């Protein structure tokens, strides 16, 4: 597997969106990964509707703006057999009745794959499959002030994550070796947060913040 991977420069990731005041991080993570997979198959890069997920994934278990899984989002997409585009079903940052329109479905999936709970499997997945949906412990206020560099929270749980995000690749900082590796992760808090809306999470630090513990990607 290569030493550095970035899928943005290959056309798998869309611009960084802002999720506002609504607990839909799982939505954006799931979409992002599914956009990557749809690009891997068709070659087209279309922005997918998060509001479709927020409103219409009840039966699968998600709670709209009160949290939800990405596996449940993928299951909803498979059972509903489609997903509307962002432009057709825009994101309004509030739960509503389902307004799904099969005439505007631009993506499909056939199920999900859960990655084992070690970082090696995560790396292999990001290298071979593409952008991956993962979860991290971001409850601490230090994560709120991230700007640049590798992020390391000493009091980061490897087992209790509260935030869903999208790993788009990985690399190193070419300074003195060891504790120089990082996961490239796309947050959904806007472009003004961090590195244009991105973050560098600790990599090969024994599953820092559980980034490799709730990893999955949809099948297409
Ligand atoms: C996520 O971080 C988000 O969408 N926004 C951050 C945020 C939090 C609070 C206000 C504004 C913005 C959410 C955050 C939760 C939702 C809001 C309430 N408090 C939260 O912490 N994170 C999630 O939804 C996580 C995502 C990960 C968690 C670990 C691995 C799986 C996915 N999921 C849940 O919180 C969740 C999922 C389910 C499913 C069934 C029942 C309950 C439930 O809760």
Swiss-Prot record:
Residues that, per the record, bind Zn(2+) 6: 160
Positions bound to Zn(2+) 7: 162
Binding, Zn(2+) 2: 50, 86
Catalytic site positions: 25, 163, 187
Glycosylation sites: 108
Binding site for Zn(2+) 5: 137, 140
UniProt-annotated binding residues for Zn(2+) 1: 9
Effect of residue 25 to S: Catalytically inactive. Unable to autocleave procathepsin L
Disulfide-bonded cysteines: 22-65, 56-98, 156-209
Membrane-crossing residue ranges in chain numbering: none
Binding, Zn(2+) 3: 71, 114
Sites where the protein binds Zn(2+) 4: 92, 96
Propeptide residue range(s): 176-178
Name used for this protein in its record: Cathepsin L
Whole-protein residues included: 114 to 333 of 333
